[PDB]
Design a protein around this ligand. Structure first.
Ligand SMILES: [Mg+2]
Ligand SMILES: [Mg+2]
Ligand SMILES: [Mg+2]
Ligand SMILES: [Mg+2]
Ligand SMILES: [Mg+2]
Ligand SMILES: [Mg+2]
Ligand SMILES: [Mg+2]
Ligand SMILES: [Mg+2]
Ligand SMILES: [Mg+2]
Ligand SMILES: [Mg+2]
Ligand SMILES: [Mg+2]
Ligand SMILES: [Mg+2]
Ligand SMILES: [Mg+2]
Lengths: 159, 204, 137
RNA sequence: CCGAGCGCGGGAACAACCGAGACCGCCAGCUAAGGCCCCCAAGUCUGGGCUAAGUGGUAAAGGAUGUGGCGCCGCGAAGACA
RNA sequence: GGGGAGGUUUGGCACCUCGAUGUCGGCUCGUCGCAUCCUGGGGCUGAAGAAGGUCCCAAGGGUUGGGCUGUUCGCCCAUUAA
RNA sequence: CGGAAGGGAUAACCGCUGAAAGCAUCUAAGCGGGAAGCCCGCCCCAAGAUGAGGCCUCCCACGGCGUCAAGCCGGUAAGGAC
């Protein structure tokens, strides 16, 4: 949590950094301690649900840090002949086996990038956003389970 | 949301560019605004449109005050138009350009206490083999001890027609402002003389 | 012979509703709706206190209720069993949820319907600024 | 037990399930079952836990890291489980 | 080989009705159920595409005309998204 | 000429982030997508919505009894009826 700027609030926590500030809805019955330059959190007891709440925020707060720190970005491969993608200003249009060229809206806080007609990164500041934005792309044209086509994260081939 | 009162004058067919087309002739005379009701003064936007002229003696009612409140010739009829604040003091057939489609609301013809077969277009019964009693009857209407009643809104013979009916998407044909006339796609509720309103359709 | 009361001036009341459990609140509203709280009670005359509530939307409700709770509106027509979840009522007219609560706890008799009138409800707050307003919890 | 106590209270309502055997009167008090937030009389009473399914508001063989409590055995700071 | 659901069939009791509760089909008019024939949505496939199989969600609407027989039922004819 | 389009929540279901359970999981906190269906949207009814609504406009004084509370009687106005 170096160089950060985590500020505690009642039911939430406002983290700041080079990328910017971002809210993160923190659970109610949790102690968001601010030890030294770093940050800690403790649970009110040792029950089943409480265990889930601690570990959850434990990472969820770690996301707010990393998000405004080094930022997030996922890649996207594209297999197939005509299958490709042209970046157009903010949004990106990509023909991928459909009569209508797909126009993809750029949501706020996110700015995907096109280093190649095949590869496509997804700049962002939140794991929830970037994670959704990634699938939103794979959703347009899932991997053909009979050969290589459609978009891919970076995982193994469907074969 | 365009809107204008008028009366069904009759209908015949014209020729578009080279094909025949049945068309009804509406008459949308100058309708003076009588009262622009804003959400402030009421709770919804609209406009009272007068219509035909009137013998000032017949309108001895307080309506005389309602007419003076806007300074206008005493009209015969006046109705509102939801979500529609235009301009000037009078709406005209200029509002509708040929090609635009419109909804026309009117009062269907009164067929009085019509038979069930006449009303819901039932089937009646056999004309030969069966008894000569149920030729035009509804036959059964329900079950046994259960429910033991009759479903409300069940179709049964009774007064029918002569009610508010609204045809839709009638394309506005040639509109002549030279006489306040307005052609449409033919079929239109009401008899030749009834009061009909014309509004903007909902294609999208 | 037991006391025979007479005409009594309507004692109005101002009632909050924030965080208040639906049932727990309606209970007191009804018991106070009729003069059942005052020792001068008389089921005959029915002279309950005029209860006025505010902050209706604020009403809490335990566990699966906003999603689980269902209401029933049956018209005389077939299939007219139209039913609505709790969340929708709060969207449309939310004051309804508490009304159908108190109404359900009021007596079935005619005077009970006369009592339901004594019950006023909104959410703002801001009642029709009349006069009486004895706050209560 | 009803029958013959379809007289009374409870059980929503219900001859025989629970209470209780009505000579009549009272604007008296204790109690029975079952109840004690409102419609509805009486504690939103006290202490201690279990359940978050509306289970409660009542269906099985079988199936499942649902949650809580007791006992046994193995590995573990001479370094365990993943 | 084992456990249920449903209350459409045959059957078993004989509890209201024998000082009467008209019984098969067809017609007319329907309404409701979903365990769905179609159309709409989805998982798996021994799913290449098309087409198909199977299971899940889903009543909103739709579910033809005719030959045989009193038939319900059923076979057949022409067609259908069914 | 209509079935819709379009908005919103949602079914099975696909998915993001993510524990309890260092891994993993769509789930328990949270979030997105997704049915001819659910709510709205279109057409019709509707203030007996006794919870009787709203806006514009027109008429308005007791003249004789009621000490009071509530009434009674003819002429009337706007306007209505025959
Ligand atoms: Mg005869
Ligand atoms: Mg009959
Ligand atoms: Mg005996
Ligand atoms: Mg008894
Ligand atoms: Mg006891
Ligand atoms: Mg016997
Ligand atoms: Mg008999
Ligand atoms: Mg395929
Ligand atoms: Mg399939
Ligand atoms: Mg189903
Ligand atoms: Mg024959
Ligand atoms: Mg839809
Ligand atoms: Mg009206």
């Amino acid at each position: 949590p170096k160089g950060v700027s985590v500020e505690v609030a009642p039911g939430r926590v406002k983290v700041k950094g080079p990328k910017g500030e971002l809210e993160v809805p923190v659970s109610p019955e949790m102690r968001v301690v601010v030890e030294e330059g770093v940050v800690r959190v403790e649970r009110p007891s040792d029950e089943r649900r409480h265990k889930s709440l601690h570990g959850l925020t434990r990472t969820l707060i770690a996301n707010a840090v990393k998000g405004v720190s080094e930022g997030y970005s996922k890649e996207l491969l594209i297999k197939g002949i005509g299958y490709r993608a042209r970046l157009v200003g903010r949004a990106l249009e990509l023909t991928v086996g459909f009569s209508h060229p797909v126009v993809v809206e750029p949501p706020e806080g996110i700015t995907f990038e096109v280093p190649e007609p095949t590869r496509v990164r997804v700049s962002g500041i939140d794991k929830q956003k970037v994670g959704q934005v990634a699938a939103n792309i794979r959703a347009i044209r899932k991997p053909s389970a009979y050969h290589e086509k459609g978009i891919y994260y970076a995982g193994e081939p469907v074969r | 949301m365009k809107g204008i009162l008028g009366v069904k004058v009759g209908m015949t067919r014209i020729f578009r560019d080279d094909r025949a087309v049945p068309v009804t002739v509406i008459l949308a005379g100058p309708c003076p605004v009588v009262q622009r009701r804003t959400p402030e003064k009421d709770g919804y936007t609209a406009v009272q449109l007068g219509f035909l002229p009137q013998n000032p003696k017949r309108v001895n009612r307080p309506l005389k005050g309602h007419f003076a409140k806007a300074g206008v010739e005493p009209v015969r009829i006046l109705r509102e138009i939801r979500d529609f604040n235009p301009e000037g003091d009078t709406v005209t057939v200029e509002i509708f350009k040929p090609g635009e489609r419109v909804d026309v609301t009117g009062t269907s013809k009164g067929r009085g206490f019509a038979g069930v077969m006449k009303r819901w277009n039932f089937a009646g019964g056999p004309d030969s083999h069966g008894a000569h009693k149920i030729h035009r009857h509804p036959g059964s209407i329900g079950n046994r001890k259960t429910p033991g009643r009759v479903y409300k809104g069940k179709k049964m013979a009774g007064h029918y027609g002569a009610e508010r009916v609204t045809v839709m998407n009638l394309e506005v044909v040639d509109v002549i402002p030279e006489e306040n006339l307005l052609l449409v796609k033919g079929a239109v509720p009401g008899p030749n003389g009834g009061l009909v309103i014309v509004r903007e359709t909902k294609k999208a | 012979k037991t006391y025979v009361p007479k005409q009594v001036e309507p004692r109005w009341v101002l009632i909050d509703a924030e965080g208040k459990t639906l049932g727990r609140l309606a209970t007191k509203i009804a018991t106070l709706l009729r003069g059942k709280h005052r020792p001068d009670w008389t089921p005959n005359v029915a002279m309950g206190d005029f209860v006025v509530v505010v902050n209706a939307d604020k009403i809490r409700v335990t566990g699966k209720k906003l999603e689980q709770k269902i209401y029933t509106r049956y018209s005389g027509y077939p299939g007219g069993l139209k039913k609505i979840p709790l969340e929708k009522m709060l969207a449309t007219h939310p004051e309804r949820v508490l009304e159908h609560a108190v109404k359900g706890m009021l007596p079935k008799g005619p005077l009970g319907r006369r009592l339901f009138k004594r019950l006023k409800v909104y959410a703002g707050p801001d009642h029709p600024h009349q006069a009486q307003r004895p706050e209560k919890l």
